[PDB]
Amino acid sequence: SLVNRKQLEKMANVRFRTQEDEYVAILDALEEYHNMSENTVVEKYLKLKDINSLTDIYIDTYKKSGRNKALKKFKEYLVTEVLELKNNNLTPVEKNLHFVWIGGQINDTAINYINQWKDVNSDYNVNVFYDSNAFLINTLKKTVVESAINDTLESFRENLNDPRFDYNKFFRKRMEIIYDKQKNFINYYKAQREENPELIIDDIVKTYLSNEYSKEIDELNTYIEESLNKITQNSGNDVRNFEEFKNGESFNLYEQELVERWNLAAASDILRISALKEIGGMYLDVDMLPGIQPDLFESIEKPSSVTVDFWEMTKLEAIMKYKEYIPEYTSEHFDMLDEEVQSSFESVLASKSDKSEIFSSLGDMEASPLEVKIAFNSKGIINQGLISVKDSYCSNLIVKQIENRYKILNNSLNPAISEDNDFNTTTNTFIDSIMAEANADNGRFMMELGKYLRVGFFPDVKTTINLSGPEAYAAAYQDLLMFKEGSMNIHLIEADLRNFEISKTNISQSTEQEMASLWSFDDARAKAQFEEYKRNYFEGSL
Numbered sequence: 262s263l264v265n266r267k268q269l270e271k272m273a274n275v276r277f278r279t280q281e282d283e284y285v286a287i288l289d290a291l292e293e294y295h296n297m298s299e300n301t302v303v304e305k306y307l308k309l310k311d312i313n314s315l316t317d318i319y320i321d322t323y324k325k326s327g328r329n330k331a332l333k334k335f336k337e338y339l340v341t342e343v344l345e346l347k348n349n350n351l352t353p354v355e356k357n358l359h360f361v362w363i364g365g366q367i368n369d370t371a372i373n374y375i376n377q378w379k380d381v382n383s384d385y386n387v388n389v390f391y392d393s394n395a396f397l398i399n400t401l402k403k404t405v406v407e408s409a410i411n412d413t414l415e416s417f418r419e420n421l422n423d424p425r426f427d428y429n430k431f432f433r434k435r436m437e438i439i440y441d442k443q444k445n446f447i448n449y450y451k452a453q454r455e456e457n458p459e460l461i462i463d464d465i466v467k468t469y470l471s472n473e474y475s476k477e478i479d480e481l482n483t484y485i486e487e488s489l490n491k492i493t494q495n496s497g498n499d500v501r502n503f504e505e506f507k508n509g510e511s512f513n514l515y516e517q518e519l520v521e522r523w524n525l526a527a528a529s530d531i532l533r534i535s536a537l538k539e540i541g542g543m544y545l546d547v548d549m550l551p552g553i554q555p556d557l558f559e560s561i562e563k564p565s566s567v568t569v570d571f572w573e574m575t576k577l578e579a580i581m582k583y584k585e586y587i588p589e590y591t592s593e594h595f596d597m598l599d600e601e602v603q604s605s606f607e608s609v610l611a612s613k614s615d616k617s618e619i620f621s622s623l624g625d626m627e628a629s630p631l632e633v634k635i636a637f638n639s640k641g642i643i644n645q646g647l648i649s650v651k652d653s654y655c656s657n658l659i660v661k662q663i664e665n666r667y668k669i670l671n672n673s674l675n676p677a678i679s680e681d682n683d684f685n686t687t688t689n690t691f692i693d694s695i696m697a698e699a700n701a702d703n704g705r706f707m708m709e710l711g712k713y714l715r716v717g718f719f720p721d722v723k724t725t726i727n728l729s730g731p732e733a734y735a736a737a738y739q740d741l742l743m744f745k746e747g748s749m750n751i752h753l754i755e756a757d758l759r760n761f762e763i764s765k766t767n768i769s770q771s772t773e774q775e776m777a778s779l780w781s782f783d784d785a786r787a788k789a790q791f792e793e794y795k796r797n798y799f800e801g802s803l
């Protein structure tokens with residue numbers, strides 16, 4: 262339990278000094294907390310937050326007070342009580358699996374992954390969120406970036422083998438052209454919406470693609486119909502009927518990412534947390550697979566020469582090689598194992614007949630009304646998997662974190678963009694505003710906001726993580742445990758986050774698909790792309 266009123270009076274007792282009125286407020290609020298048997302978990306948390314806030318008021322009022330050592334210890338007790346509140350009062354998680362595929366037609370590979378969850382969780386409703394107004398964003402982004410690639414290499418027709426026209430310079434020069442084309446489209450988009458506010462996104466995009474890039478609406482219209490048919494056949498759910506999301510403060514940020522930045526991961530970040538707040542259930546990226554039965558490979562020891570990640574990948578590659586649940590699944594890592602280890606996998610999998618003894622099921626899950634649980638990998642927490650009851654306290658904290666982070670971003674970015682300058686001057690203006698606002702509380706966050714204009718187009722640009730991804734989740738948990746809102750500097754240690762982590766037995770994250778990012782790319786991928794583009798251009802494979 263947590264100390265009662267007279268227990269705290271013993272802790273904060275002054276041998277000869279009067280009961281200040283800031284002190285009795287703490288005492289009264291504490292007494293009220295222990296008389297809250299008829300109140301909800303969330304109401305109890307809000308009362309602990311009141312108690313913490315009054316304690317801070319006292320401490321700040323009488324800075325060298327003899328009580329302050331006891332009261333600071335009391336504040337540690339309050340955090341412990343929150344974790345115990347979280348862990349000891351659970352309620353059922355709605356049986357929904359939420360997936361997101363927006364911006365274009367859904368791939369057979371995503372469907373195949375989704376279907377494995379379906380096969381082992383028949384009692385779960387499954388939504389695949391899509392945007393019926395925005396099937397053409399991916400085509401738009403591909404058309405612009407491919408035009409930019411060609412314009413770049415044209416500019417450099419003769420230094421194709423000049424060892425100095427290296428992959429870093431190519432992406433630097435391409436970024437300049439992408440920005441001018443991207444600004445061209447955004448300007449056209451804002452014009453069409455001002456002239457007509459009831460045009461849908463795909464309307465504006467297919468006219469733009471027709472005028473500027475010579476594609477023809479007939480084909481794009483057939484694509485749209487084919488994409489609507491496919492997603493309807495596969496548990497599709499239209500964002501455009503997700504009322505509360507659409508009417509919310511976050512919808513503008515969703516549309517900023519979808520329409521202006523062409524960042525479908527970030528748009529999906531904004532959408533997934535509202536699905537969790539408004540509906541409850543479990544969110545999953547389409548490259549995630551069900552967890553593997555914990556006993557399955559227990560007889561097979563991991564080779565000393567192999568990383569834990571490598572081993573995890575080969576476990577899924579073995580299932581697929583022998584059961585073929587998913588077509589064309591890679592065996593690249595499994596094939597590097599000793600024949601004897603490979604044979605150990607074969608005989609384990611030969612002993613099993615039904616998918617249910619390969620992949621486990623989610624079953625009846627329960628969580629705290631306070632929390633959102635989050636997946637993790639060796640790098641840290643990762644929002645590729647999320648569990649929450651409807652309207653959890655943390656889901657609201659996370660929505661607020663994301664909204665505040667976008668407000669800070671757009672305060673600096675919108676004035677920079679409003680001056681119709683090129684990529685380099687806009688970048689410099691933007692970064693200068695961001696730096697003028699940077700402080701000890703936000704440094705690393707602001708450091709990453711400064712790369713925002715390049716997300717998706719330049720290697721190693723990871724701003725989304727700080728804006729709508731995991732860091733916003735970390736900050737929300739810190740908000741919860743510090744009885745506040747708006748944390749910007751993360752001081753939680755890994756131990757702290759473990760209270761909010763999803764059990765590894767519930768998701769298999771080391772999948773083939775999880776190895777290639779859809780919104781970012783690293784230097785090796787950048788370099789291989791650059792030398793393939795060169796030979797595509799040479800061969801005139803535009």
Ligand SMILES: O=c1ccn([C@@H]2O[C@H](COP(=O)(O)OP(=O)(O)O[C@H]3O[C@H](CO)[C@@H](O)[C@H](O)[C@H]3F)[C@@H](O)[C@H]2O)c(=O)[nH]1
Nearest residue numbers: 361362363364525526529546547644645725726730778779
């Ligand atoms: O054309 C497209 C391309 C992608 N998406 C969405 O973006 C999601 C994430 O794609 P992906 O797995 O490649 O991102 P990831 O590299 O793991 O990035 C992490 O960080 C991301 C940023 O925080 C976070 O979104 C993600 O969960 C992390 F794992 C994907 O599951 C779709 O929902 C889409 O809807 N349409």
Ligand SMILES: [Mn+2]
Nearest residue numbers: 546548645775
């Ligand atoms: Mn992924």
